[PDB]
Every structure is written in C-alpha cells, then in structure tokens.
Amino acid sequence: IDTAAKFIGAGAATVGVAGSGAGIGTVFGSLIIGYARNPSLKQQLFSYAILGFALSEAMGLFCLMVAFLILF
Amino acid sequence: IDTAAKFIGAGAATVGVAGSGAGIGTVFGSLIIGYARNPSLKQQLFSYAILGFALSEAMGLFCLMVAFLILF
Amino acid sequence: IDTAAKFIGAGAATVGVAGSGAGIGTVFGSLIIGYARNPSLKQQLFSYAILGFALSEAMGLFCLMVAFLILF
Amino acid sequence: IDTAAKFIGAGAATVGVAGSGAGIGTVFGSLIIGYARNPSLKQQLFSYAILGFALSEAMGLFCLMVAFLILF
Amino acid sequence: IDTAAKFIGAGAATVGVAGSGAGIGTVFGSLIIGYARNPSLKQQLFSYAILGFALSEAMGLFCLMVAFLILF
Amino acid sequence: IDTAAKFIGAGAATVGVAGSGAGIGTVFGSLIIGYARNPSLKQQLFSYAILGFALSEAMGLFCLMVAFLILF
Amino acid sequence: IDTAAKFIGAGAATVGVAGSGAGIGTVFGSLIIGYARNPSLKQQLFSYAILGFALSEAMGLFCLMVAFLILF
Amino acid sequence: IDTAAKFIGAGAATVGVAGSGAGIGTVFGSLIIGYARNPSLKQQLFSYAILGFALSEAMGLFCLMVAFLILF
Amino acid sequence: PYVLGTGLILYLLSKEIYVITPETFSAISTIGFLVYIVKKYGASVGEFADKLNEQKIA
Amino acid sequence: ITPVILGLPLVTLIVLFPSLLFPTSNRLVSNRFVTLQQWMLQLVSKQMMSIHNSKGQTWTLMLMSLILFIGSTNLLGLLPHSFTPTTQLSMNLGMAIPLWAGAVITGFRNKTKASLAHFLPQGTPTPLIPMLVIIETISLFIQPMALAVRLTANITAGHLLIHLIGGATLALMSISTTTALITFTILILLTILEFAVAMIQAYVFTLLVSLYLHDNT
Amino acid sequence: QMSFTFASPTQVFFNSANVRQVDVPTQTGAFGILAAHVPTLQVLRPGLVVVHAEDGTTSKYFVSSGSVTVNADSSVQLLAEEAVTLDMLDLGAAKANLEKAQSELLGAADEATRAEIQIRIEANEALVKAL
Amino acid sequence: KIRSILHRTHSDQFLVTFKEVGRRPPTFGDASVIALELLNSGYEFDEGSIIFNRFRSVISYKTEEKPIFSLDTISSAESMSIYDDIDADVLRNYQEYSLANIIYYSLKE
Amino acid sequence: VAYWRQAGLSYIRYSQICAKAVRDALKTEFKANAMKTSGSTIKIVKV
C-alpha cells in the first residue's frame, strides 16, 4: 500500500513526457520547413527554435521532477 | 488503500501535461513558420504566441493542480 | 474499496484534459499562420478562433466535471 | 470488486475524450487556416466545418455514453 | 477478480477510441483546406474524405468491439 | 490475479489502436490536400496511399494481436 | 501479484505503439504532400520515406521489446 | 506488492515513448516537406533534421531510463 | 407577445407536474431566461426587420 | 401511465401548431397573429433550404419535417426539470426507431444486402473491393444510426450535468448563496455553450446523412 | 513598404508606390501581399485587388489577370493584365453578365468554353465580390 | 518592311507577322493576341530575340533586340527558388503573360 | 488553371478571357474605352 503505490505513481507520471518529445518534433519540424522558405537561418528564426524547444521541454522537466519525487 | 490510491492517483493526473507539452511546441512552431512568412515579428504575431502559450498552459496548470491535490 | 477507487479513478479522468491543451495549441497555431497570410485580424479570423477554442476547452470542462464528481 | 471496479472503469473511459478535444481543434483550426485563403466562408467551408465537428463529437457521443453506463 | 478486472479492462479499451476522434478531424480538416484550394467539392476530395473517414472510424470500431467484448 | 489482470492487460493493449486510427487520419488527409494540387489521382498519389495505410494499420494489427494474446 | 503484474505490464508497453503508428502516418503523409510538389518521386523524397519510417518504427520495436520481455 | 508494482509501473513509463515515436515522424515529415521545397538537402536543412531527431529522442531516452530503473 | 406569455405559462405547468428539486435546477434555468430578455430585445429588432418586409416583398 | 402518456402528445402538439398555421396563412387574415407565426416556417424555408437541392425537390420537404422535429423536441427538454435524466432519455429511445427507420425507407428496404448501392457506390467504400463495402456498411449506416441516438443523448448528458452539479453545489454550500454563486454562474452560461450549440449541430447531422443517401439514389 | 507596381496597360496605379499591402487573387486563393514580401511569383486570377496602400487607405480594384511578382524586395509588381479600379466596372453589368454567363455556361462547350464562361463567371463574381 | 531582311531566306521560318502595324495604334490585346498562339511553336528559347526600334526620341530609336527568356527551365534552376513557390505553370504563366506585355511594348517601341 | 489550364489555355488564353471578361464587364462611360487596347489592328499574317 505504501511501498507499492509510489512505483505505480512515477510510472504514470512518465506519460507526461509524451508531449515534450512530440512537441519538439513539431517545433523543430516547423523550423526545418520554415528555413526552406528562407533566408533568416543563422539568425531570427533558428534563434526562435531554441526558444521553442525549451518551452516544450519545460513541461518535460516539470513532469520529470514529479517522477523523481515519487521515487526518491 | 487510503495512502495507496492517493499515491497512484497523483501519478495518473500527471498525464495531463502531455497535452500542454506538445501544445506549446505547436503554438511556438506556427510562430516559427509564421515569422518565416514575415515580418510583423515584434507585436501582432509574437505577441499572440504569448496568448497561445497561456491558453495551453492553463490546462497544464489545471492538471498540475489535480496531481498536487492528491499529494498534499 | 468505496473511497480508495474514488481517488485513483479521478486521476484517470484528468488525462482527458490532454486533448483540450494540445487542441488549444492547434486552434491558436492555425490562427497564427492564418493571420500570417493575413489581413482580417480583428473579425473573421480571430473571431473564428474564439468559437474554436470554446469548442476545444469544452472537452476539458466536461472532463473536469467527471473528475470533480468522483472526489466531490 | 463489483462496485469498486465500476469507479476505476468509467475514469479510464473518460480519457477517450482527448481524441474529441484535439480533433475539434484540428477541424476548426483548419477552417481558420482555410477562410484565410478566402472567400467561401459563408457556406461551403464553415458549413462543412459543422459536418467535421459533428463527426468528431460523434466519437465524443460514444465515449461519454460509455462512462455514463458504468455510473448508474 | 473475475468480475472486477473486466470492468477496468473495458475502460482502457475505450481509450483506444481517442485515435479515431482526432483522426476524424485530421482527415475532414485536410479536406476543409483542400476545397480552399478548390474546386473538387462533391467530386474527388470529398469522395475520398468519406474513404478517409471509414479507414479511421474502423480503427474505432475494432476498438469498441474490444470494449463490448469485455462487457458482454 | 492470474484470471484477472490479463483481462485488464488486454484493455491496455487496445490503447495501441490510437496510433493506427490517428495515423490513418494523417495519411488519408495529406492525400486529400495533395490531390487538391492535382492531377495525380490514380497510379501515383492514391497508389502511395495504399502503401501509406499499409504501414499505418501495421502497428494496429500488431496491437490487435497483442490483445488477442491476452484473451485466447 | 508476482504472476498478475507481468500481464498488466505487457499491455502498458503496448500502448507505446500508438506513437510509432501515427509517426508513420505523418512521415508518409508529408511524402504524399511532398510528391504533389513534384517531380523527384523516385529518389530524394520517397527514398527518404523509408529512412523516416525507420527511426519512427524504431520506437515501436523497442517498445514491443519491453512488452515481450514482461511476457517471456 | 513491492515485487508486483514494479512491473505495473515500468510498463506505464514505456507509454512515454509515444512522444519520441510521433516526434520522429513529425520532425522528419517536415524535413521531407522542407527538402521538397528545395535545395539545401546536403547540410543546412537535413543537417538540422539530425538536430531535431536528437532533441526528440532525448525525451525518449529519459523515459526509457525510468522504465529500466523500475525493472532492474 | 400574448403567444409568448401563453408558451411560458405552459412551460411552468410542465415543470410543476415534473419537478425533481426546487432551487438549484431553478437557478440554472432562471439565469438562462434572464439573459435572454436583454439579448432578445436586440434580436427582436432584427426579427422585426426581416419579416414583415419579407412578407411584403414576395 | 399518465406521465409518459402526457409527454408524447405534448411533443407532437408543439410541432403541430406551426404545421397547421402555415397552410392557413394563404390568404387570410392576417392581423397580428397569422403574420407573427408565419415566420416560423419562413425561417425553416430560409435556413435549411440553403443546403437542400442538392438531393432534389422530391425528397426535400419530407426530411425538413424531421429536422425541425428533432430541434423542437430538444428545446422542449431544455426548460423542464426534472425531465432530462428519465423523460428525455425515454424520448431519445422513442426517437431511436425513427432514426434507424430513416435509412430503411430508401436504403435497406430496396437493398438490404448492399444499401451502399443507394448511399455511396464509390467513395468511402471501395467499389473494387466488395469486402470493404460490407465492412463500411456499419461505419456509414449501422453505427451512425446508433450514434444519432447517442447524438441527442449527449445533449441530454451535458444538460443533465449542469442541473446535477448545480444542485449538488448549492446543496454542499447551502450558504445562501454564497460561494456556490461563483460556480453556479458558470453552470448557467454552460447551457448556451452546451445545449444551444450542440442541439443545432444535432439536426445538422440528420440533414447531411439523409442528403448523402437521396443525392446518390 | 513595398514599392508596388500595380499596373495594367490601362494604368499603373502604384508605380512602385510604398504600399503596405495588396490583396491579390492568385490562382488558388490569394494573399495580401505585405510590404516588401519574399520572392514568390504568382500569377493572378481575377479577384479584386485591393491595394492597401501603406497610407491607411486601401484602394479597391478588380483584377482579371496578369502576374504579380513579388520580388524578394520591395518591388512588387502586379502587372495585372487587366487591372482596373472598380469605378469603371459595373456591378449591374457584372451581374447581368453573370446572368448571361451562367446561362451560357450550360451550353459552354468543353472545359475551355466553360472555363471561359466560368472565367467570366468567376470574373463576374470576382468583380461582384467587391463590387 | 522588316520582312525584307529576313524575307528572302524564309517565308517559312517566319511564324507570324502583324499587319496593320500601327494604323489604329497597335495595342495590348493584340499583344496578347499575337502572344497566345505564338506559344504553340517548337522553338521556345532557342532564345528568341525581339528586335524593335526602341525609341530614344521621336526621331531616334535604336534598333533593338532583347532576348527571349523562354526558359522555364534554367529559370527553373537557380535563384528562383527564392520565389518560394512559383510553378512551371505560373512561371510560364507569367512568361506567357509577359510575352504579351512586352509584345505590346516592343511593338510599340 | 484546371478550369483553364485543363488541357491547354494559355495564361494568355485564360487571361485574355479574363480580361476579356473585363472587357465584357465594365461600366459605361468607361465602357467605350476597352477595345482600344485589345487585339484590334490585329491582323495577323506570317507575311
């Protein structure tokens, strides 16, 4: 009851990373298709893909801290 | 049972941040493809990306309130 | 059994807000690239964005109505 | 077992509303990125948007009737 | 055991109907942007959209049959 | 436990049919927005759509045989 | 418990085949909307279609390896 | 209980590989749409596709680490 | 106006024979009505504009 | 007996007055009365006809009666309470046969084995593969007719929960109001966001499905 | 700004005028080509050309054909084969013409006539949008 | 009267001639008119030249040539991508369109 | 362009019909002026 439910609590909290990995594929895809239209690659746009791959992983560090809380 | 179901129940509510995680990558993705079409970056477009990351993390803040209700 | 399964079952209904949060990033993102091709900002386009997010968070408010009915 | 499993059995059927939640955002979002190409907004496109939103809340009319069957 | 985990087995089978609901919007939303390029409405694209609505709701029928299997 | 958790293990294996159902909507949508560009209806684009819906429900037949292994 | 959890754990890793089956629907979709732009159908695009469906089915064959390991 | 819940928790973490699988398809699909727009296939755009498969498999290796920690 | 008043009276009678609970179910409906009055007057000017003119045209 | 018996005639009667009145309006009177009521069918013949024909004059007016009936029946479940959890559900099950019979009239009656020969020969169902035609006969008829009952029942569910949650919130916090007023203020606004939207979209579904049949027939 | 060259043999309206936007019926849809836009070349299509001159104004136009040419730069040249101001274009005629058009379409021979008719219809509409 | 220094070597590798050159001053329509069918031909940028007298003054013009980009090809190649989308349609359908434009023009010049 | 490019119809053919359709259209005062820029001293030879 006490020792068991903490193992089945950090397991369902790892299913919150299913957005941080797919959303990073959405932002880095829109920067992959965005740079095709050109020409601001070494400035402006690829400097906005770092600001997008962080806000997506921001719910990937907030979710990861809950799975690290239920374990230790 | 009383300390068990609230420890495995707080883990299932952390699967609500998978929506805000990928939902943040899309709103910041369409702003990367939008500013690629140029040029109203500051104001209008990138000022709406805050209005799109706020209505998406509102369900995230609503989901992170549920997992903290069974944890404390 | 009658109170234990009411705490771990209100957590599985909090994963239904994963659609309202990822859908909000699609209803605002497709409005960012929409006004990028422009020009009807106020009225028509952003007016259709409000009637779309209301039909996106409706599956979040009804899912938080089946969540709060299992704990209160 | 009989009444206990009826509580964590309509809660897992409540996470099926995540498909209708983001599906309504993908449908109405495409209509916002469609009338931006213009101009067949009145009928043709927004009239077809009521055919796509009904065929997306159809899965929402079959998933909410499932959780309401394990209740009473 | 026999009567218990059959109720929590039909609920998780109803979560497999979250692909058909978001599949219905991404198939009838690409046709909502197809007629925006025009003019094959009631010709080729809207005819194939029904052949796209059937291929996605069948993966919702093959999942609702598993939910009906663990209910009768 | 033995004659119980396999009935709730076939429910979780039927959640893998949320990718074969939402993968068909992504496939039979881009072959509706791509035919809008025209005029490769037969032999090319819809022929590749048969090979697109072949590697989409291939993850679903592999998910319908995983649930069939937890029943028969 | 010792024999019960392996059955409930094999189905839970079979829900990780929902990401590979939709990632094949996006890669083959953007190749169906990547061949309409023309003209290098053979090589370049559809040659990288199997190269994009290899890294996306790599997450499924690793997930169905963790589902088979709890079964054998 | 203690040797049981480790198998019903390590499996739920494999459902975090749903974002790594659907993120690999989206980052490569928009790379297949970006190289369909031409012409910098050799470096610049497909080189960035490697910088998009890495920041998307990182949320799939961190999720596979938590599943391996609850199994061994 | 008289028709509307008759229609409301019928509804009240229908509630009386079939009522579950007195107050909260009422509070939900009553705010539903009240919003409509102010909204309705604005809609009614539109309703008025259409019709008797559409009758006259055809 | 009385309760269920009283309900069905009442739903019939509300649809009856409009349908009697319009035939009457064709020469008298009109005073205030006939010309106030004549609009009802002017709004029907205005709004719905923008989609119709399409399938031709022949089938048009037959379907428009049902489209109006469905919307008006839901409106008569709006206000009355208690009503939603029992009476509206019995009416959803009483409307169930008409919705299933609607496909029969032209489809299954003339061709049961392959009703898609009248509905949609080439489209959803693959005409090259008779196997898929029979499989998708469920997705295009057998299930959509069950979903049309669930269609009105989802309006029933969302309308019900507003009432139940209201009731329970004012019962939980019987403060007069007080804090329950904040929640209850939202629960009211939900009636427009829920019922008034979903009720319209409901009879749109009946419109579109009954068009796709008779348009290819 | 885009020095927007808005032209027809009829007229050069904006003659590389530092315009904020022109909304242009390209063939699929349009776009409201905004002030200096990327190169992209689009061939028009009748619609209305609405020249959101930088100024606050937008001037209205009907366009029938040509190409607008969206240079990389600020030069945008709509060279509409036909570029007209709506002033010169009669709604009434358009409609009537449309009446006809629609009439004609029915006996229009082949996609090319139909097309033509249609071009015309579309056109007639395309004035009619604004007009 | 141009068809003189050319008209004696062919009569066949001519494709067209315009008559009523000027007269009621020649114009755009015509330019298109003459533009359209012209397209139909087997030489497309075996690079045309368009030779006309580009005016300088009412009295001097300089007998001109300009080159006829009927490439939709090498123009497909290059810095045309930058015309981020454009189609060998719309391309051509500008090439087309410009053929009249110019045609009118040259004609006028 | 499928409603004209279908098979054939130049951008000119199209255009000209468009334009023609303009010529077809137009208000009145204004309406005289159209044909002026048209194919008129159009007299095509190859001679």
UniProtKB/Swiss-Prot annotation, chain I:
Cellular compartment(s): Mitochondrion; Mitochondrion inner membrane
Upper taxonomic lineage: Eukaryota, Metazoa, Chordata, Craniata, Vertebrata
Covered range of the whole protein: 76 to 133 of 256
Subunit structure: Component of the ATP synthase complex composed at least of ATP5F1A/subunit alpha, ATP5F1B/subunit beta, ATP5MC1/subunit c (homooctomer), MT-ATP6/subunit a, MT-ATP8/subunit 8, ATP5ME/subunit e, ATP5MF/subunit f, ATP5MG/subunit g, ATP5MK/subunit k, ATP5MJ/subunit j, ATP5F1C/subunit gamma, ATP5F1D/subunit delta, ATP5F1E/subunit epsilon, ATP5PF/subunit F6, ATP5PB/subunit b, ATP5PD/subunit d, ATP5PO/subunit OSCP.
Highest rank taxon of the organism: Eukaryota
PTM-bearing positions, type N6-succinyllysine: K56
Coiled-coil regions listed in the entry: none
Organism: Bos taurus
Name listed for the protein in its UniProt record: ATP synthase peripheral stalk subunit b, mitochondrial
Family: Belongs to the eukaryotic ATPase B chain family.
Task of the protein: Subunit b, of the mitochondrial membrane ATP synthase complex (F(1)F(0) ATP synthase or Complex V) that produces ATP from ADP in the presence of a proton gradient across the membrane which is generated by electron transport complexes of the respiratory chain. ATP synthase complex consist of a soluble F(1) head domain - the catalytic core - and a membrane F(1) domain - the membrane proton channel. These two domains are linked by a central stalk rotating inside the F(1) region and a stationary peripheral stalk.
Swiss-Prot record, chain J:
Catalyzed reactions per annotation: H(+)(in) = H(+)(out)
PROSITE patterns from the UniProt entry: ATPASE_A
Gene3D superfamilies attached to this UniProt entry: ATP synthase, F0 complex, subunit A
Cellular compartments annotated: Mitochondrion inner membrane
Main location: mitochondrion
Coiled coil: none
Molecular functions per Gene Ontology: proton channel activity; proton-transporting ATP synthase activity, rotational mechanism
Record field: transmembrane: 1-20, 59-79, 88-108, 129-149, 155-175, 180-200
GO biological process: proton motive force-driven ATP synthesis; proton motive force-driven mitochondrial ATP synthesis; proton transmembrane transport
InterPro entries the record matches: ATP_synth_F0_asu, ATP_synth_F0_asu_AS, ATP_synth_F0_asu_bact/mt, F0_ATP_A_sf
CDD domains to which the protein is assigned, alphabetical: ATP-synt_Fo_a_6
GO CC terms, sorted: mitochondrial inner membrane; proton-transporting ATP synthase complex
Function: Subunit a, of the mitochondrial membrane ATP synthase complex (F(1)F(0) ATP synthase or Complex V) that produces ATP from ADP in the presence of a proton gradient across the membrane which is generated by electron transport complexes of the respiratory chain. ATP synthase complex consist of a soluble F(1) head domain - the catalytic core - and a membrane F(1) domain - the membrane proton channel. These two domains are linked by a central stalk rotating inside the F(1) region and a stationary peripheral stalk.
Membership in a protein family: Belongs to the ATPase A chain family.
PANTHER family the UniProt entry points to: ATP SYNTHASE SUBUNIT A (PTHR11410:SF0)
Name the UniProt record assigns to this protein: ATP synthase F(0) complex subunit a
Swiss-Prot record, chain K:
Sites of N6-succinyllysine modification: K100, K129
A single GO cellular-component term on record: mitochondrion
Localization of this protein: Mitochondrion; Mitochondrion inner membrane
Presence of keyword Membrane: yes
Keywords from the named record: Acetylation, ATP synthesis, CF(1), Hydrogen ion transport, Ion transport, Membrane, Mitochondrion, Mitochondrion inner membrane, Transit peptide, Transport
GO MF assignments: proton transmembrane transporter activity; proton-transporting ATP synthase activity, rotational mechanism; structural molecule activity
Disulphides: none
Top-level taxonomic group: Eukaryota
N6-acetyllysine carried by residues: K100, K129
GO biological process, one term: proton transmembrane transport
Major location (coarse): mitochondrion
Oligomeric form and interacting partners: Component of the ATP synthase complex composed at least of ATP5F1A/subunit alpha, ATP5F1B/subunit beta, ATP5MC1/subunit c (homooctomer), MT-ATP6/subunit a, MT-ATP8/subunit 8, ATP5ME/subunit e, ATP5MF/subunit f, ATP5MG/subunit g, ATP5MK/subunit k, ATP5MJ/subunit j, ATP5F1C/subunit gamma, ATP5F1D/subunit delta, ATP5F1E/subunit epsilon, ATP5PF/subunit F6, ATP5PB/subunit b, ATP5PD/subunit d, ATP5PO/subunit OSCP.
Family: Belongs to the ATPase epsilon chain family.
Protein name, entry field: ATP synthase F(1) complex subunit delta, mitochondrial
Species classification: Eukaryota, Metazoa, Chordata, Craniata, Vertebrata
Gene name in the database record: ATP5F1D
Swiss-Prot record, chain M:
Residues recorded with modification N6-acetyllysine: K20, K31, K36, K43
CDD domains in the record: F1-ATPase_epsilon
GO molecular function, one term: proton-transporting ATP synthase activity, rotational mechanism
InterPro entries: ATP_synth_F1_esu_mt, ATP_synth_F1_esu_sf_mt
SUPFAM superfamilies in UniProt: Epsilon subunit of mitochondrial F1F0-ATP synthase
GO cellular component: mitochondrial inner membrane; mitochondrion; proton-transporting ATP synthase complex
One of the protein's GO biological processes: proton motive force-driven mitochondrial ATP synthesis
Mitochondrion in keyword set: yes
Chain positions found as N6-succinyllysine: K20, K31, K36
Major place of residence: mitochondrion
Subcellular location: Mitochondrion; Mitochondrion inner membrane
Keyword vocabulary terms for this entry: Acetylation, ATP synthesis, CF(1), Hydrogen ion transport, Ion transport, Membrane, Mitochondrion, Mitochondrion inner membrane, Transport
Domain of life assignment: Eukaryota
Transmembrane spans: none
Subunit structure: Component of the ATP synthase complex composed at least of ATP5F1A/subunit alpha, ATP5F1B/subunit beta, ATP5MC1/subunit c (homooctomer), MT-ATP6/subunit a, MT-ATP8/subunit 8, ATP5ME/subunit e, ATP5MF/subunit f, ATP5MG/subunit g, ATP5MK/subunit k, ATP5MJ/subunit j, ATP5F1C/subunit gamma, ATP5F1D/subunit delta, ATP5F1E/subunit epsilon, ATP5PF/subunit F6, ATP5PB/subunit b, ATP5PD/subunit d, ATP5PO/subunit OSCP.
Family: Belongs to the eukaryotic ATPase epsilon family.
Protein name according to UniProt: ATP synthase F(1) complex subunit epsilon, mitochondrial
